[PDB]
């Protein structure tokens, strides 16, 4: 062979029913599953020699339904709520001084004592 | 938190309702809904167990006063204009009224 | 099944690694060159090195967990897949020799990164033949390509620079 | 050529009788849920697959008892109960947060408030949609809604010992609670029943406490002041 | 004899079916991007890259057939029963202008998607058929690419007087 790129690769495999049932569950945490046994690896009228060569006789929509692991979803919500809860406690610290806004029924309103006082 | 979730599994004995709870949590995680809607709709799931509900409010960091403030407004999702009003086109928004004034 | 096309992916293999792969294949099929079995370092060592070299840069436990599981899965996957689609008929007999001689030593520990770059280039077809989702595909491919970059960095040590000619008994026992 | 195509198209259209539009059957039967109507309209195909509503339900076809989900009562403290057409739940039409004035129509399926599809943004799945099992353990952007079911000792005690112990423990807790409360009587009375005349004191003799000042904020927000001086404590005049 | 409609356009067509029929929402008839405007834009973009004069000629005559067929077809097999009132109102308002200058891509794509069943009755030469169909394919791709500018963003609610007028 003589090619300049030939940007591929080739290697001779054995029968692909164990290899392709793992590469599915690689990134997954759910262990692989099996199937009916006597259909898995038979001769199918092919008796093979030792050499194991050939035996002769643009946008897109949000469209799917996903199956997610309940472990990750739970562990994500605990981390998702932890950050949001700390952010709320961070802004819960309220220390402000004003005179004539009405803003909330908040924590620091001795303000209203000021504009009502000098007259009374 | 692990205690909270095994107790939720205990209380919600029906796997369909448990899955709906988890789906609500996922909505929050992704950011479609916020903490107000999360708690106001989790009350309908977890109210039968005071321990579970107090634990959930402790997780969310929501005081009971603030929960009572947010409940009625963040439970049912209705349009802001009410369920019976709707906006008009700009064309028919200036039909003549020869007796009106600026006031 | 969607709008008829959805484009196939590609791992941006470094050109140096491309040349290495092509020259290695050519020398092993025409010049009867073989791989020093076993090697030093090993596949497990290289994976552990990439782990310790890239882990200190993640800034989230989500990324930490997904990356940890990804690298551990790559270990177990090379374990399960080395003896199917990662050799040729020539060194198939060398594999037979090591398989029958070393009783229970792990194949990931026996082999080296030279058989890891092959899995790294063959991953696109394997992802294509199966049915995973887009985010998982992108995650695995990004980790594989940064692994390839790390290998390009540490080339001088990770790639042995010579082979050995097949012995007469070996070439006669393989025939080809 | 295509000139002739145009001629044949024009001849067809001006020979035939006009009709109303309908997109092809491919596009129509593409999605799940959508379906044509009697006069070419769009109607969702989620209706009661069985066919006035039976107001009071007591027994189920599976023997399961009929108790409301929120109050756990039995369709007799209120003259009507509702059965969710999606789960095995029953709700009083008064226990829902906006209480339903009238029961829904027996034609359309009714969905209880304990489902996540009330707050998802609506979407459409094609009717050839292999459910993909995503392996990414954590951090999966999923548009919130398209995640389908998250697919993955016999003791023979026979004693009432623990039941008797639990009953006595409950009675003891009750006894302690009642004791504490009935001692804090004679002070609950004074601080909760005369609580209507101490506000009168701190109003008449105008002493500034937090609630007085909040009431004055309430009156300012009613009168809608802008930038003038606040008149006085007893002379803002929504009298 | 079949076409390749992108999934975004399929979703948009079904959403428009629902909005116009069940939810009582219509489209503002005077469009900012005109049908003639979009036709001219696509024509210019394709000719600027075409190769030979024979192809130039066939593409030009294809676009001409397209515009004349739109102008002759709109008011006969392109509107729902909830838009005929609006159609007659627009004809009364502008009786001198034409539909190719009035309507938009929201209806041009109904024409495009429905073309297969029409070429089903028509039986001209397969060469012309395949040329026209490839042109329609490229047009659909161009529209779904330039979505941001050609398609309307929000629909308009019909007024009570309009609904009492139509009543169908
Ligand atoms: Zn009830
Ligand atoms: Zn329900």
- φ, ψ for residue A34, nearest 5 deg: -110, 180
Could you tell me whether strands E156-157 and E25-26 are parallel, antiparallel, or unpaired per DSSP bridges? antiparallel
Question: Interface partners of B (3+ CB pairs, < 8 Å)?
Answer: A, D, E
3-state helix, strand, coil in chain C (%, to 5): 70, 0, 30
Q: Bridge partners of E26?
A: E156
Q: Are C77 and C140 in contact (CB under 8 A)?
A: no
Query: Which of C3, C25, C130 lies at the smallest CB-CB distance from A23?
Result: C130
Helices E105-121, E7-21: axis angle to 10 degrees equals 100
What is the C-alpha separation between A80 and E104, in angstroms, rounded? 46
CB contact under 8 A, D136 and C131: no
Establish whether chain D is in contact with chain B, requiring a minimum of 3 CB pairs below 8 angstroms. yes
Please report residues of C whose CB lies closer than 8 A to that of D139: 62-63, 66
The ligand minimizing its distance to the Cα of D116 is 2
Q: Bridge partners of D133?
A: A67
Interface of C with D (CB under 8 A): 1, 62-63, 65-66, 69, 131-133, 135-136, 139
The ligand minimizing its distance to the Cα of B20 is 2
- Helix H, strand E, coil C: the string for chain D is CHHHHHHHHHHHHHHCCCCCCCCCHHHHHHECCCCCCCCCCCCCCCCCCCCCCCCCCCECCCCCECCCCCCCCCCCCCCCCEECCCCCCEECCCCCCCCCCCCCCCCCCCCCCCCHHHCCCCCCCECCCCCEECCCCCCCCCCCCCEECCCCCCCCCCCCHHHHHHHHHHHHHHHHHHHHHHHHCCCHHHHHHCCCCHHHHHHHCCCCCHHHHHHHHHHHHHHCCCCCCCCCCCCCCCC
What is the C-alpha separation between B76 and D111, in angstroms, rounded? 13
Tell me whether residue C103 is in a domain: yes
Please report residues of C whose CB lies closer than 8 A to that of D132: 131-133
Please report residues of D whose CB lies closer than 8 A to that of C131: 130, 132
Find the A83 Cα to ligand 2 centroid distance in Å.
31
Q: Are C64 and C58 in contact (CB under 8 A)?
A: yes
Q: Are D150 and B24 in contact (CB under 8 A)?
A: no
Say yes or no: E61 contacts chain B, CB-CB below 8 A.
no
What is the C-alpha separation between C144 and C116, in angstroms, rounded? 10
- Shortest Cα distance from B9 to chain E (angstroms)? 38
What is the C-alpha separation between C73 and A26, in angstroms, rounded? 6
Q: Are C67 and C55 in contact (CB under 8 A)?
A: yes
CB contact under 8 A, A64 and D132: yes
Quick one: which H or E segment has residue C112?
A: none
- Which of E99-138 are b and which e, b meaning 16 or more Cβ less than 10 Å from the residue's Cβ? bbebbbbbbbbbbbbbbeebbeebebeeebbebbbebbee
User: What is the extent of the structural domain holding C120?
Assistant: 9-176
Distance of CA C111 to the CA centre of its chain: 9
- Shortest Cα distance from C70 to chain E (angstroms)? 33
Helices D2-15, E53-77: axis angle to 10 degrees equals 10
CA-nearest of A70, C41, E41, C81 to B20 is A70
| Test mutation, D12, D16, D20, chain E, max E CBs within 10 A | D20
Helices (H), C55-167: 61-85, 89-101, 107-110, 116-129, 134-153, 155-158
Please report residues of C whose CB lies closer than 8 A to that of A29: 69
CB contact under 8 A, A58 and E145: yes
Find the D122 Cα to ligand 1 centroid distance in Å.
29
- Shortest Cα distance from D89 to chain A (angstroms)? 23
What residues have CB less than 8 Å from B56, skipping those under 6 apart? Answer: B4, B39, B42, B46
Torsion of CA C145, C150, C156, C161, to 10 degrees: -30
Cα–Cα distances (Å) from D11 to D7, E73, E151, in that order, read 6, 11, 31
What 3-state DSSP class applies to C34? Answer: strand
Tell me whether residue C2 is in a domain: no
- Using CA of residue D107, residue D112, residue D116, residue D121, what is the dihedral sign? positive
CA-nearest of A120, D69, D6 to E131 is D6
What residues have CB less than 8 Å from E151, skipping those under 6 apart? Answer: E12, E105, E106, E143
The ligand minimizing its distance to the Cα of D96 is 1
Cα–Cα distances (Å) from D202 to D193, D198, D208, D213, in that order, read 17, 6, 7, 11
Q: Are D44 and E18 in contact (CB under 8 A)?
A: no
- DSSP notation for chain A: ---S-----------SSSSTTTTTTSS-SSPP----GGGSS--TT----SS-S------------EE--HHHHHHHHHHHHHHHHHHHHHHH------SS----S-S---TTHHHHTTT-
What is the C-alpha separation between D59 and D56, in angstroms, rounded? 10
Query: Which of B24, B31, B72 lies at the smallest CB-CB distance from D116?
Result: B24
Q: Are E158 and E27 in contact (CB under 8 A)?
A: no
Cα–Cα distances (Å) from C124 to A16, D1, E80, E97, in that order, read 16, 46, 48, 57
Tell me whether residue C53 is in a domain: yes
Find the B44 Cα to ligand 1 centroid distance in Å.
12
Q: Give the CB-side neighbour count of residue D59, counting CA atoms within 13 A.
A: 3
Find the B31 Cα to ligand 2 centroid distance in Å.
24
What is the C-alpha separation between E20 and E15, in angstroms, rounded? 9
Q: Report the chain C residue with the minimal C-alpha distance to residue D134.
A: C133
What is the C-alpha separation between E26 and E107, in angstroms, rounded? 12
Could you tell me whether strands D82-83 and D90-91 are parallel, antiparallel, or unpaired per DSSP bridges? antiparallel
Tell me whether residue C67 is in a domain: yes
Tell me whether residue C160 is in a domain: yes
Find the D94 Cα to ligand 1 centroid distance in Å.
7
Question: Interface partners of D (3+ CB pairs, < 8 Å)?
Answer: A, B, C, E
CA-nearest of D82, D93, D144 to D119 is D144
CB contact under 8 A, D118 and B22: no
The ligand minimizing its distance to the Cα of D112 is 2
Find the D71 Cα to ligand 1 centroid distance in Å.
4
CB contact under 8 A, C133 and D132: yes
Say yes or no: C133 contacts chain A, CB-CB below 8 A.
yes
Q: How many residues does chain C have?
A: 176
CB contact under 8 A, C4 and E4: yes
Say yes or no: E116 contacts chain B, CB-CB below 8 A.
no
Cα–Cα distances (Å) from A89 to A93, A95, B40, B62, in that order, read 7, 14, 20, 10
Could you give the number of structural domains in chain E? 1
């Amino acid at each position: 062979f003589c090619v300049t790129c030939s940007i591929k690769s080739h290697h001779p495999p054995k029968h692909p029913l164990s290899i392709w049932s793992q590469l599915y569950d690689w990134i997954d945490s759910q262990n692989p599953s099996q199937y009916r046994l006597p259909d898995d690896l038979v001769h199918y009228f092919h008796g093979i020699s030792r050499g194991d060569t050939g035996a002769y006789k643009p946008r897109l929509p949000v469209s799917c339904l996903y199956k997610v692991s309940e472990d990750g979803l739970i562990k994500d919500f605990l981390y998702a709520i932890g950050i949001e809860a700390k952010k709320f406690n961070n802004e819960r610290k309220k220390r402000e001084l004003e005179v004539i806004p009405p803003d909330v029924k908040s924590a620091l309103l001795p303000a209203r004592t000021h504009p009502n006082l000098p007259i009374a | 938190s692990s205690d909270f979730f095994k107790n939720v599994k205990n209380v919600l004995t029906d796997v369909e309702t448990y899955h709906e709870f988890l789906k609500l949590l996922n909505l929050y995680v992704q950011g479609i809904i916020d903490r107000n809607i999360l708690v106001s709709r989790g009350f309908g799931f977890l109210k039968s167990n005071s321990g579970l509900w107090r634990s959930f409010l402790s997780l969310t960091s929501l005081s009971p006063e603030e929960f009572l403030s947010v409940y009625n407004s963040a439970c049912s999702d209705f349009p802001e204009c009410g369920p019976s009003y709707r906006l008009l086109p700009v064309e028919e928004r200036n039909i003549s009224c020869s007796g009106r004034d600026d006031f | 099944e969607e709008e008829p096309p959805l484009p196939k992916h590609k791992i941006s293999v470094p050109d140096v690694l491309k040349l290495w792969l092509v020259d290695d294949w050519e020398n092993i099929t025409k010049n009867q060159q073989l791989i020093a079995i076993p090697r030093n370092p090993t596949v497990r060592a290289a994976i552990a090195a990439f782990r310790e070299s890239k882990i200190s840069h993640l800034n989230n436990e989500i990324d930490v967990d997904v990356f940890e599981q990804a690298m551990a899965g790559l270990v177990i996957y090379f374990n399960k897949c080395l003896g199917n689609m990662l050799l040729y008929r020539f060194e198939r007999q060398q594999y037979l020799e090591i398989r029958q001689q070393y009783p229970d030593t792990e194949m990931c520990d026996l082999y080296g990164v030279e058989h890891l770059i092959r899995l790294f280039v063959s991953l696109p077809e394997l992802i294509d033949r199966t049915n995973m989702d887009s985010q998982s595909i992108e995650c695995l491919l990004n980790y594989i390509e940064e692994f390839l970059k790390y290998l390009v960095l540490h080339k001088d040590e990770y790639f042995i620079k010579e082979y050995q000619n097949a012995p007469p008994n070996y070439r006669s026992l393989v025939g080809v | 050529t295509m000139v002739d195509v145009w001629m044949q198209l024009c001849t067809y259209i001006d020979s035939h009788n006009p009709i109303q539009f309908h997109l092809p059957h491919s596009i129509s039967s593409f999605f799940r849920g959508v379906g044509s109507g009697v006069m070419g309209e769009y109607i969702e195909t989620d209706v009661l697959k069985h066919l006035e509503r039976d107001p009071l339900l007591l027994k189920s076809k599976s023997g399961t008892p009929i108790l409301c989900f929120r109050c756990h009562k039995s369709a007799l403290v209120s003259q009507s109960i509702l059965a969710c057409d999606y789960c095995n739940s029953y709700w009083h039409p008064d226990c829902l947060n906006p209480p339903l004035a009238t029961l829904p129509s027996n034609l359309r399926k009714w969905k209880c408030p304990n489902h996540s599809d009330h707050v998802t943004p609506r979407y459409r799945l094609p009717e050839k949609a292999k459910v993909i099992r995503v392996g990414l353990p954590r951090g999966f952007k999923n548009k919130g809604n398209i995640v389908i079911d998250e697919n993955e000792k016999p003791f023979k005690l026979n004693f009432l010992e623990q039941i008797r112990d639990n009953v006595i423990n409950l009675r003891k807790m009750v006894e302690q609670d009642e004791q504490l409360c009935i001692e804090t009587f004679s002070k609950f009375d004074f601080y909760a029943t005369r609580d209507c005349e101490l506000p009168l004191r701190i109003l008449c003799d105008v002493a500034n406490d937090n609630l007085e000042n909040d009431d004055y904020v309430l009156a300012l927000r009613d009168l809608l002041r802008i930038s003038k001086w606040d008149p006085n404590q007893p002379v803002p005049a929504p009298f």
